[PDB]
Write a protein that binds this DNA or RNA. Structure first.
Ligand SMILES: [Mg+2]
Lengths: 125, 234, 167, 95, 142
RNA sequence: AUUCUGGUUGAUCCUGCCAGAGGUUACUGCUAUCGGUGUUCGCCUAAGCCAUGCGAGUCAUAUGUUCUUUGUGAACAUGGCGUACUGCUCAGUAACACGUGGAUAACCUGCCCUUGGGUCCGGCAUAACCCCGGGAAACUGGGGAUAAUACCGGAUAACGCACAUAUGCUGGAAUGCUUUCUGCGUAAAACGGAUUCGUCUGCCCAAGGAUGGGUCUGCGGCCUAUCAGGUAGUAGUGGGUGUAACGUACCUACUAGCCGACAACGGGUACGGGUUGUGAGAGCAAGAGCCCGGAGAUGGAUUCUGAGACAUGAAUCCAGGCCCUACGGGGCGCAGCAGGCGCGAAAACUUUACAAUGCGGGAAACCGUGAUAAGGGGACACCGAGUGCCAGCAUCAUAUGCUGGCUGUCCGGAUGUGUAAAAUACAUCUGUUAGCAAGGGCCGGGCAAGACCGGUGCCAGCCGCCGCGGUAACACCGGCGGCCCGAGUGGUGAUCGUGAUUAUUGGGUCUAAAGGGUCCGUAGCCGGUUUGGUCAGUCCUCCGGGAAAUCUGACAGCUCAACUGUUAGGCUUUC
């Protein structure tokens, strides 16, 4: 659980005095980070019967060659780097926009594993 | 899902008498703004049943049909140009918007008559289908001849196409809002004025003016193809 | 909310000597009971006067013709103004016409009772009717067309002409 | 007591006759059974079949509103008419 | 007080400051009347009578004005209350329940030749002291 | 009716307030017959605390079991839907909370809606029931039997990556749908129920709508400087994260911004608006009730369930108070309806019914409904009536007389209309010696009313203000009389008007309160004639809006009336 309601001052620093409680629709879940392990997923429910698939661990990827446009599933070994956080590279976290290392070759994750339910990585040219 | 006596919609001609709620219309296919309950229609306009229980009884016994469908629920919405058919008297009535934006009923002559609809968004269902954003009856998922706002006509109750009433410059047009509601007249110029809100249209019947494209109905080639105006019975 | 205040008005100073004298004279002449009855009659008078002022300010337009003719048609229906009257005649309107339209005044000047208060009690005690309606209201506002059909009630004893107090 | 009838619309959706009439009674407002007995002879409706919903008498003049009705079946009346109307309308031999 | 066309702001500001020089508007907005008076906007009250004083009148006039000393129960405020009418102190004594109301004089303050007294009795033991003064009611033994 | 009157003076003019005079609101003294209308009656103190009943329940055409009053009759269980809509309150909130115009191409939607599809194999628990109980209760154990639209497992999609493929909408506008297919990970349903076997209603699915709601921003509306700086997740960029979705909403690297002296930050206060009060109007003051949106459930945090909640009749714990106990433990919070204590100046019946209007339930018949309607009670607001009428006759000119009769609007009765059934109301009749049905203030001035008689003696008292009484009180107390109002009539606040006493309209500032000691001077504000160009304020006009409600007039209909509907106007404003 996290609160994603509109609570960060107004424009100036005058502390916004809340007139409403923490509503149910403003409650966001936890960042279920993904690592390189046994491929584990959970069918967490969301609004309107939309069970969003959340991934937690994975050592395989759907590496997509751009030269020929062929999709083959190759194992994930290590995150090469990541622009979003300099610590996920050390933690082997698999976020979107990171760069993983597969058997096919180095690839960049182009899918959000916490929302997509799979690790779809485009093979870097 | 309640609505009160005071906050009854502007398109609802029935007054502000009684005690709070007046027959909450369902979600339905048509907009709630231009909608009246079939129970309220049969209990106020036609005066075939006076109570709500007796109205629910007569609806439930398959005695009133809305485009050939005997709806058993007294909360069914009704949109503009809707036909209500009663075979036992051969009473045909059409939902119409008068000059003040309110919804009324005009009696028809024959029991069997078409119904007019409109095109609002042509989307593509997977399978090579040109979905026209239909809401009522059966239709034809057609081709690019069927454009937006084309105002298709379809039979009852099978709801097959009768004639593609495509609009052009000079063709007939019926207003569906504003201060010009019910002032049907020929189209003068349908200008595709680019703007962030929506385009515009030029229409002149008895008197010329400018009107919005969402307040125009392509109701005929040169003359009324459908039975537009019969008898205005309260 | 949606409630309503009074109909009549009130004097700013409530003990004007000549004004109170005219009030008592009108009340005693027309057989009224309350000062507020005269006040509300003058309030209808000033309603017609204020409508006349609002119309005569413009000096009659596509919809102001309707707003200026509907009041004249209603007054000719009720006859507070002259039959051959205009908009401007309402501006010179005194409250005797309003009191004349009162049914007690009408029955007093129809000779159905000797005195005005006897007309009051006859109207209230079902002795004045109109085409079968046993109306018992002194404050009833009638038309010139309403005036002819007025008579005793068929159930009241004065329909039989044996009343000694009756003329 | 006198009666004159004006509106006799028949609802096709229920197969019943709507009786609207003016009650020219004298003096005492007649009861529902008496007005039914008088209204029966005007349109050939039995007491069990002829039904009256109100004999509402106005102020002053002895005139009343009668909203009576006619059915082609007493079972149809029991299915459609409310139980208070069935009790209020005395059946032949009712108690 | 600028008479230019595009000078509504200056006129609004100068009307805003000049309004405060009135006593009534400033005292209404500042809430001095609610903060000051014991009844707090209540039209009448209810206090326990403690002591009875026949306070003297003004300088030109000469008289004794019977004024009970009453402490309110709603607020515990100690004030002085003038009891009107002939035989005024006969129907009120120590340790009573008496309704009190403002004397309704000058500016809502003390009225007539009574110095320093702003409240008046209107009823003793929830019965009208005016009728006791007249002689149409009798003092309860409570 | 666009209103003046007394008070400072020996007398005048006048500045100037005070007080008088009219609404409305709250409360209340005195007091009293009735009907109509509807959108009032624990808001102002205590959003204090609550005994008692109750307010949401329903499903036989989902499955299962025992009876019969043999019927959509009832009882139990599994299960579906609903209880997140109404209803109450008005603390918090000075805020995209709200009003209003757009947006969502940035999003979710059970019921409902139309078209395009599908509805495929199975598996077999556990209920009531049986056998034994435990338990003060709250609760609830074991073994035996078993079913479903219960629940689980399997096949044909959506979701995300990468691709190529033709305008399909909208259109500044793809970023969406997409013809798509490609391969890579990746799915549903109940061939259920009933039938007249005609069919009806349900499950899954795709597209869209509609409904519900989140988000978003142009603009509109408080007091305050005896409140000058505020802000570091604060302002922004890239990459992410989580979300229904956009978003510092959170995280990371970075930049050094952001708001404010044209009022930030803080304090004061407040549910916002539609509107209401008042006045000739400009305005000024309040926004309890009817409708729209917002928030809240003892204060507070957290969470399950669900399409939807952080749920008024859900939980959990803390604080706080209370409560049932067999002392091992177990509940509860009426800002839901009547009611109680408390509170105070400050307000009702623990009535009636699903008859109607609605809502959920059902396929239907129908059931529940302190929602709603119907009443009871409260000098709520408005409106309508009557307590008398009456010829002749007499004084002191309107009071009881003397007499003569006469009417039943009221009150009581009868009877029916009538409502779910009442009651009122409604019609005829009839009850009355017209008697049962008027009071309240005030009398020196302001101000309509007594210079009449005793009392009291700067005393009792009056008195909004002025002013009265230490000996002749039209002043004060009883009387006598008189006056105004009217089932009402006063009192104290409040507030509007008075008052041009806040003045833009519309005031003054030499001597009455008031020109700053002078002056220089920013924002602001005010600005020469003149040719040329634009048309933003402005101007005429058009088109989208500005919910109804309340306002005005009439018509129509309630007996007149207020009131409901139609309608022509108003407001909504100042987009
Ligand atoms: Mg959920």
């Amino acid at each position: 659980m996290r609160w994603q309601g509109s609570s960060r001052r107004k424009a100036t620093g005058g502390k916004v005095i809340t007139a409403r409680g923490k509503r149910k629709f403003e409650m966001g879940r936890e960042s279920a980070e993904t690592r390189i392990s046994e491929i584990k997923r959970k069918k967490v429910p969301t609004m309107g019967g939309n069970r969003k698939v959340r991934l937690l661990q994975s050592n395989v990827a759907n590496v997509t060659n751009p030269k020929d446009g062929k999709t083959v599933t190759a194992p994930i070994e290590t995150v090469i780097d990541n622009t979003a956080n300099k610590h996920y590279v050390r933690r082997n976290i698999l976020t979107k926009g990171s760069v993983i290392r597969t058997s096919m070759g180095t690839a960049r994750v182009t899918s959000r594993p916490g929302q997509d339910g799979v690790v779809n990585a485009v093979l870097i040219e | 899902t309640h609505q009160k006596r005071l906050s009854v919609p502007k398109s609802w001609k029935v007054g502000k008498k009684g005690n709070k709620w007046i027959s909450t219309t369902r979600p339905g296919p048509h907009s709630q703004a231009r909608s009246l309950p079939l129970g309220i229609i049969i209990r106020d306009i036609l005066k075939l049943v006076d109570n709500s229980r007796e109205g629910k009884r007569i609806l439930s016994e398959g005695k009133v049909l809305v485009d050939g469908i005997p709806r058993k629920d007294l909360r069914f919405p009704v949109g503009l140009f809707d036909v209500i058919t009663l075979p036992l008297v051969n009473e045909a009535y059409r939902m119409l918007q008068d000059e003040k934006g309110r919804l009324t009923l005009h009696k028809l002559n024959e029991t069997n008559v078409n119904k007019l609809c409109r095109i609002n968004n042509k989307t593509t269902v997977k399978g090579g289908k040109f979905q026209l954003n239909l809401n009522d009856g059966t239709n034809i998922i057609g081709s690019n001849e069927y454009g937006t706002k084309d105002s298709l006509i379809l039979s009852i109750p099978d709801k097959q196409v009768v004639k593609h009433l495509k609009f052009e410059v000079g063709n007939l047009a019926m207003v569906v809002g504003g201060q010009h509601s019910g002032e049907t007249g020929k189209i003068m110029e349908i200008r595709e004025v680019k703007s962030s809100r929506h385009n515009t249209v030029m229409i002149s019947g008895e008197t010329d003016f400018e009107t919005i494209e969402d307040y125009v109905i392509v109701i005929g080639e040169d003359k009324p193809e459908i039975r537009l105006g019969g008898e205005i019975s309260e | 909310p949606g409630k309503k205040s009074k109909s009549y008005e009130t004097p700013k100073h409530p003990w004007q000597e000549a004004r109170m004298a005219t009030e008592v004279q009108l009340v005693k002449a027309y057989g009224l009971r309350n000062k507020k009855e005269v006040w509300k009659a003058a309030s209808m008078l000033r309603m017609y006067r204020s409508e006349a002022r609002k119309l005569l300010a413009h000096v009659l337009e596509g919809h102001y013709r309707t707003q200026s003719e509907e009041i004249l048609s209603k007054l000719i229906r009720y006859g507070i103004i002259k039959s051959d009257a205009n908009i401007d005649d309402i501006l010179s309107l005194k409250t005797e016409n309003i009191l004349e339209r009162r049914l007690q005044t009408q029955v007093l000047r129809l000779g159905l009772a000797r005195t005005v208060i006897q007309a009051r009690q006859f109207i209230t005690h079902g002795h004045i009717a109109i085409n079968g309606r046993k109306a018992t209201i002194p404050g009833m506002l009638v038309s010139k067309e309403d005036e002819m059909h007025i008579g005793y009630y068929g159930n009241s004893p004065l329909k039989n002409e044996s009343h000694p107090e009756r003329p | 007591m006198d009666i004159k009838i004006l509106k006799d619309k028949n609802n096709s959706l229920l197969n019943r006759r709507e009786l609207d009439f003016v009650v020219k009674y004298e003096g005492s407002t007649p009861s529902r059974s008496d007005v039914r007995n008088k209204l029966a002879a005007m349109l050939n409706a039995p007491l069990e079949l002829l039904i009256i919903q109100r004999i509402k008498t106005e102020y002053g003049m002895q005139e009343s509103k009668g909203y009576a009705k006619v059915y082609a079946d007493e079972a149809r009346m029991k299915q459609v008419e409310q139980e208070y109307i069935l009790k209020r309308n005395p059946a032949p031999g009712a108690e | 007080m600028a008479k230019g066309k595009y000078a509504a702001n200056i006129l609004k500001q100068t009307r805003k400051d000049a309004r405060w020089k009135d006593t009534y508007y400033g005292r209404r907005v500042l809430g001095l009347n609610v903060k000051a008076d014991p009844l707090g906007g209540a039209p009448q009250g209810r206090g326990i009578v403690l002591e009875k004083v026949g306070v003297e009148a003004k300088q030109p006039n000469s008289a004794i004005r019977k004024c009970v000393r009453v402490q309110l129960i709603k607020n515990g405020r100690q004030v002085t209350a003038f009891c009107p009418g002939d035989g005024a102190v006969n129907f009120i004594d120590e340790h009573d329940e008496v309704t009190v109301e403002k004397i309704g004089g000058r500016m809502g303050g003390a009225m007539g030749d009574i110095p320093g007294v702003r409240f008046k009795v209107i009823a003793v033991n929830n019965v009208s002291l005016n009728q006791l003064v007249i002689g149409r009611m009798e003092k309860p033994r409570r």
